[PDB]
Amino acid sequence: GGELTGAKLSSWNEPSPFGMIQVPRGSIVLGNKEADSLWGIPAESRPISVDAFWMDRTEITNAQYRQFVYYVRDSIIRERLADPAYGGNEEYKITENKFGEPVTPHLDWSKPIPSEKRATEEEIAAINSVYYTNPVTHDRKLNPDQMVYRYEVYDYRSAALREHQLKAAKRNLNTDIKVDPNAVVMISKDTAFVDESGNIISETITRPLSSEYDFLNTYIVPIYPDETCWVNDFPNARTEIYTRMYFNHPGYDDYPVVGISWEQAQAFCAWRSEFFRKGIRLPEGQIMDDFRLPTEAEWEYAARMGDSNNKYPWSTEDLRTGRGCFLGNFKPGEGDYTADGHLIPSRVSSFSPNDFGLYDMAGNVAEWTSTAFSESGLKQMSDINPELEYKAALTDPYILKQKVVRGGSWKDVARFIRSATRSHEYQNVGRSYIGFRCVRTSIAF
Amino acid sequence: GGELTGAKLSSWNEPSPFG
Amino acid sequence: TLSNRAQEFNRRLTQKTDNAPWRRVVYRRVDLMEESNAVLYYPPRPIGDRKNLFSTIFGLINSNSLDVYEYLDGFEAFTDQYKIKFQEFLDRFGIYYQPSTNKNAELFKVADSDIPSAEVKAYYVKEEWYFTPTNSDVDIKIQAICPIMTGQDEFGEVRNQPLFWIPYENIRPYIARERVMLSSLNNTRNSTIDDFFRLNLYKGDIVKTENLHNRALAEYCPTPDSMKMESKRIDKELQGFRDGLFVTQDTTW
Ligand SMILES: *[C@H]1O[C@H](CO)[C@@H](O[C@@H]2O[C@@H](C)[C@H](O)[C@@H](O)[C@H]2O)[C@H](O)[C@@H]1O[C@H]1O[C@H](C(=O)O)[C@@H](O[C@H]2O[C@H](CO)[C@@H](O[C@@H]3O[C@@H](C)[C@@H](O)[C@@H](O)[C@@H]3O)[C@H](O)[C@H]2O)[C@H](O)[C@H]1O
Ligand SMILES: *[C@H]1O[C@H](CO)[C@@H](O[C@@H]2O[C@@H](C)[C@H](O)[C@@H](O)[C@H]2O)[C@H](O)[C@@H]1O[C@H]1O[C@H](C(=O)O)[C@@H](O[C@H]2O[C@H](CO)[C@@H](O[C@@H]3O[C@@H](C)[C@@H](O)[C@@H](O)[C@@H]3O)[C@H](O)[C@H]2O)[C@H](O)[C@H]1O
Ligand SMILES: *[C@H]1O[C@H](CO)[C@@H](O)[C@H](O)[C@@H]1O
Ligand SMILES: [Ca+2]
C-alpha cells in the first residue's frame, strides 16, 4: 500500500449564470426589533445564517417569461406536427438514431417549424391548434388552456430522510428497537397526465413506501400569465388597458411580469434549469443545482445586504435621497402612487441597486418565495439555511396553500416595502403586483 | 438552450392624435 | 381527516428536547387582565361562534375529545389515575348542569352563564427551556396549562382555585384552528392560540421552578414584592444563560 495520500476527484467547471449576482454567505437577524404599536402587530426577530447563492439582478421581465411561453408553444406545435391526429410528419419526432437502434422518442429541434405562409394544410392546422380567435373581436392569441408545461421534480430531501429508508432495518439505528415486519410507511407524491379526452388530471397518491418513484412529483401546469388580474384586483377602475397591453406591448418588455402564480413560477424555474442544462458541457461526475424561488430568509438576507441595521435595501433610513428622489416604486402618498414617478410597475433598474447589486428589492412588484406561510414560521425554521417547505395535497384545505411574499409592490405603503415585512398569497393566485426572481445555490470554497 | 435572454416583441409606432 | 402531507408536516413541526444538554422547567402565572394576555380571554362569553380559550376547553371536555388531569399541590401526574371525571368537577366547583339530550359530544347540559369562561382569569404555564444539541440554540416548549378560576372566597376575600392540567399536546390540534386577534388596536383575526403560545407572546411571572427541593416561590417569598423580585432574578438567570452561550459581542480582544 504505502502512506495515506488522497483520492482526489476530477476538477469541475462552475458556469456563472447570466443576469445574476453573487450573494455571499453570512448572518442576519430576520425581522424587526421594534413594532409600530398602531398596526397592533408584535415584533418578531430571529438571527439566522445562510450560504452563498446566485440571485437574479432584477425581477423576471415580460420578455424573459415570454421566452418560456414561446418554448412551450413551439414544443406543443412540434408534438402536434409529428402526430397522425393533426399532421403525421415523422421528422418532428426522432425515435431511432443514425444506426437504427431504438431510442427515447424526442423532438427534433433542428428542423424549423413551417412558416404560416409556406405551410401546408396539415402544418397550418397543427400551428393553429394552439391558438384561439375571439369570434367577436377576431383577435388571435395563444390559448391559455393549451399552454401547459409538464415537468418532474425528485424530492432528494424526502428520500434522504431516515424514516424513508427503502430498507426497514435502516430506519432505526437504536439497537434496542426491533424492526416490525408489518410496519408500513405511507408516502405522498404528485402525478399528472393527459387523458384521451385531453383534460389534465392531477392527483396526490398516498401509498406504502416501496421504491424511488415514491419521491418523484409530476406536474402539468398552465403557464400563460393571468392578464385579467388588472381588472380583478381593482374594481371600479380603468385598468383593462393593462389587461390588454401589459404582457403584449413591446414597450413593457423590460417591465416585471405579473399575474404569475406560485405554481407557474416553479414551472418557469424548472424550465430554466432544464434549458440551462441542455446548453452546457459537464465533465463526468459534475452535479449542479437547479434554479428555484428564494427562501424568505434568503430573500430577506439579500434585500438588506446581509446587514441587520438596514430596514430597506439601502443604507439610509429615509425613503428619499438628499435631493428628494424616492428610492423605490411604491405608493408614497394617500391615493398618490405617482409621487416616485410611476403609477404601475416600472422598467427594471429604474432606481439605484443594492450594495449586493440587486434592483427593485423594495417596491415595483412583490416577489414569490418558496417558503410556506405560517404565523410562527420564524420560530419553526432552522438556524442554518432556514426553510419551511410544504407540498400541499390537492384535497388539502385551501388555508394550507399560502406562500410567503416579500418586498412590497407599486401599490404598497412604505410599511410593506420594508424588507422585514411578510405578506402571503395562495399558490394558485396571480396578482398585478406580484412577480418573482430566481436563485441558485452556488458551490463555492 | 442556454441562458435567459428575452423574447422581445416587435416595436410599434405611436401616432400623435391631431388636435 | 388530515392528509398524509399535513401529518408529515405537523410531525416535522414538533419540538424535540430528548438529548438537550441543558434544560429548565419554569411554572409561570399568566394574568388575563393584562394587554397582550387578554388574547386568551376575549370574548369573556361566547359571541356566536367566538369563544375564548376556556370556553373551547370546556366544550372539548363536554365531549370525549380532551383528557384533563387533576391539579395537585407539588407535582403533575398525567396518568389514568389522575384523569379528571367531568361529572365530579361541576359539583366540586359548583357548575350548574342538567342531563344531556344526546350522549354524543355532550356529557351533560351546561348553560353559558354557568361556564366560568369569564371567571377564569389566570393560567398556569409549564415551560421547558432547552438547548438543542444539533443546532446549538435555546428554545421553549410548552408542557401544560392550567386555568385559574377567580371566584370570590366564601366569607370574604378572593380565592383563586386552579382547575386542572391540560397537556399541551392534547389541546394543540384544537387551538390551531381558531383564529384570534392579538391586539385591541388591530381587530384582524390573523393568528391562532397555538401561534400565541408558540411565539411566547404571553407575559407571566415565574411562580415555580424545577429544583432539587421541590420548592415553590411562595414557600420562601412571603410578600408579593419579594415574589416579583425572585421572578425577576430567575428571568435574569435564564437570559444570562442565553447571553453566555455566545461570545460574538465581546470586544475585550
Ligand atoms: C415540449 O414541452 C411541452 C410541455 O410544455 C410538451 O407538451 C406536453 O405533452 C404533449 C404530448 C401534450 O400535448 C401535453 O401534455 C403538453 O403539455 C411537449 O411534448 C414537449 O416536451 C416533451 O418533449 C421534449 C423533447 O422531445 O425534447 C422533452 O425534452 C426533455 O426530455 C427528454 C426525455 O428523454 C430529454 O432527454 C433525456 O435527457 C437528455 C439530457 C439526454 O440524456 C437524453 O438521452 C435523455 O433521454 C431531453 O433532453 C429533454 O429536453 C420533454 O421532457 C417532454 O416533456
Ligand atoms: C404519475 O402517476 C400516473 C399513474 O397514477 C402515471 O401514469 C399515467 O397515468 C395513467 C392513468 C395514464 O394512462 C397515462 O398518462 C400514464 O402515463 C403518470 O405518468 C405519472 O407517473 C409517475 O409516477 C409513477 C408512479 O408513482 O407510479 C412512476 O412510476 C411508474 O412507472 C415506472 C416506470 O418504469 C414503473 O416501473 C416499471 O414497472 C414496475 C412494475 C417494475 O417492473 C419496474 O422495474 C419498471 O421499471 C413503476 O412501477 C410505476 O409506478 C412513473 O415513472 C412516473 O412518471
Ligand atoms: C423578598 O425577600 C425575601 C427575603 O429576603 C426573599 O426570600 C425573596 O426571594 C424576595 O427577595
Ligand atoms: Ca420588487
Helix/strand/coil (H/E/C) assignment for every residue in chain A:
CCCCCCCCCCCCCCCCCCCEEEECCEEEEEECCCCCCCCCCCCCEEEEEECCEEEECCCCEHHHHHHHHHHHHHHHHHHHHCCCCCCCCHHHEEEECCCCCEEEEEECCCCCCCCCCCCCHHHHHHHHCCEEECCCCCCEEECCCCCEEEEEEECHHHHHCHHHCCCHHHCCCCCCCCCCCCCCCEEEEEEEEECCCCCEEEEEEEEECCCHHHHEEEEEEECCCCCCHHHHHCCCCCCHHHHHHCCCCHHHCCCECCCCCHHHHHHHHHHHHHHHHHCCCCCCCCCCCCCECCCHHHHHHHHCCCCCCCCECECCCCCECCCCCECCECCCECCECHHHCCCCCCCCCCCCCCCCCCCCCCECCEEEEEEECCCCHHHHCCCECCCCCCCCCCCCCHHHCEEEEECCCCCCCCCCCCCCCEEEEECCCCCCCEECCCEEECCCC
And the C-alpha cell for C26? 419554569
Compare all CA atoms of chain B with the CA of A278 and give the residue at the minimum distance. B1
| Cβ–Cβ < 8 Å for A41, C182 | yes
- Three-state DSSP state, C128: strand
Separation in Å, CA A160 to CA A170, A369, C131: 12, 23, 25
Closest CA to A105 of A83, A77, A122: A83
Our CA-based measurement puts residue C14 at a distance from the nearest CA of chain A, in whole angstroms, of 9
Separation between Cα atoms, residue A300 and residue A419, nearest integer Å? 6
> Which DSSP string do the residues of B1-19 spell out, in sequence order?
--S----PPPP--------
CB-based burial, A96-113: b 16+ in 10 Å, e otherwise: eeeeeeeeeeebeeeeeb
Contacts of B1 in chain A (CB under 8 A): 274-279
Which residues, other chains included, contact C188 with Cβ-Cβ below 8 Å and sequence gap of 6+?
A40, C181
Interface contact flag, A19 B3, Cβ < 8 Å:
yes
Bond from prior residue into C43 cis (ω within 30 degrees of 0): yes
A257 annotated among ligand-binding-site residues? no
Do residues A330 and A418 touch, judged by C-beta distance below 8 A? no
Q: By three-state DSSP, how is residue C6 classified?
A: helix
Sequence-distant (6+) residues with CB within 8 A of C106 are C62, C63, C100
Bridge-based pairing of strands A366-372 and A434-435 is parallel
Residues 35-74 of C with CB under 8 A from A: 36
Nearest by CB: C13 against A187, A380, A395:
A380
Q: How many Å apart are CA A113 and CA A99, to the nearest integer?
A: 25
Ligand 1 atom 2, closest CA:
A75
The tally of CA atoms less than 13 A away on the side-chain side of residue A84 is 0
Closest CA to C71 of C54, C60, C62, C83: C83
CA distance A407 to A294: 12
**Cα–Cα distance for residue pair C236/A35, rounded to 1 Å:** 24
A363 is in an annotated binding site: yes
Name which of C1, C2, C4, C5 to mutate to probe chain A: the one with the most chain A Cβ atoms within 10 A of its Cβ. Answer: C5
Q: C198, A42: Cβ pair inside 8 Å?
A: no
Distance, in angstroms, between A38 CA and closest chain C CA? 6
CB of C136 less than 8 A from some CB of A: yes
Taking Cα atoms as reference points, which of C136, C133, C87 lies closest to residue C110? Answer: C87
Is the dihedral angle over the CA atoms C165, C167, C168, C174 positive or is it negative?
negative
In whole angstroms, what is the distance from residue A337 CA to residue A364 CA?
11
d(C-alpha A100, C-alpha A188), whole Å: 40
- Give the Cα separation of A134 and C207 in Å (integer): 73
For residue A225, the CA-to-ligand 4 centroid distance in Å is 18
Task: Classify burial at A187, counting beta carbons within 10 Å of its beta carbon; exposed 0-12, middle 13-18, buried 19 or more.
Answer: buried
Nearest residue to C67 (alpha-carbon basis) of C82, C55, C54, C53: C82
Resolution (A): 2.4
Q: Do the annotations mark residue A263 as ligand-binding? A: no
Cα(A157)–Cα(A160) distance, rounded to whole angstroms? Answer: 5
| Residue A310: closest CA among A353, A354, A359 | A354
CA angle A19, A22, A27 (to 5 degrees): 145
CA of C234 to the centre of ligand 3 (A): 12
How far apart CA A27 and CA A143 sit, in angstroms, is: 46
In terms of Cα–Cα distance, which of A324, A325, A307, A407 is closest to A359?
A407
- Report CA-CA distances (Å) from C77 to A237, C74, C80, C178: 63, 10, 9, 28
Which residue of A379, A384, A422, A423 to mutate against C (max C Cβ within 10 Å)? Answer: A379
Rounded Cα–Cα distance for residues A33 and C212 (Å): 37
Q: Do C186 and A39 touch (CB under 8 A)?
A: yes
What's the start-to-end Cα distance of chain C, in Å?
Answer: 59
Classify each residue of A318-339 as buried b or exposed e, where b means 16 or more C-beta atoms within 10 Å of its C-beta. ebeeeeeebbbbbbbeeeebee
Give the method of determination.
cryo-EM
Contact state of B7 with A69 under an 8 Å Cβ cutoff? yes
Helix axes A262-278, A62-81, angle to 10 degrees: 70
Question: What separation in angstroms does the CA of A78 have from each of A29, A70, A279, A292, A351?
Answer: 50, 12, 20, 28, 42
Closest CA to C20 of C126, C124, C125, C141: C141
Q: Which helix (H) or strand (E) holds C167?
A: strand C164-167
Instruction: Determine the Cα–Cα distance for residues A231 and A248; give it in Å rounded to an integer.
Output: 16
Closest ligand 3 atom, residue C227 Cα: 10
Task: Output the residue whose Cα is nearest ligand 2's atom 30.
Answer: A213
d(C-alpha A419, C-alpha A172), whole Å:
42
Give the number of other Cβ atoms within 10 Å of residue A267's Cβ.
23
Q: How many CB atoms lie within 10 A of CB A132?
A: 15
Cα distance between residue C198 and residue A223, in whole Å: 38
Handedness of CA A414, A417, A423, A426 (dihedral sign): positive
Q: Which three cell numbers stand for residue A307?
A: 446587514
CA distance A116 to C15: 62
Query: How many whole angstroms separate alpha carbon A219 and alpha carbon A150?
Result: 6
- Among residues A361, A299, A300, the alpha carbon closest in space to that of A327 is found at A361
Give the closest-approach CA distance of A186 to chain C in angstroms.
Answer: 7
Residue C98 CA: distances (Å) to CA of A67, A116, C86, C116 = 71, 82, 13, 16
HSE on the CB side for A188, CA within 13 Å?
17
Which letter does DSSP use for residue C216 in this model? B
Contact A297, A381 (CB under 8 A): yes
Asked whether A68 lines ligand 1 (CB < 6 A), one says no
Cell readout for A297 is 430568509
Q: Is the CB of A79 under 6 A from ligand 1?
A: yes
Q: Which of A384, A383, A401 is nearest to A392 (CA)?
A: A401
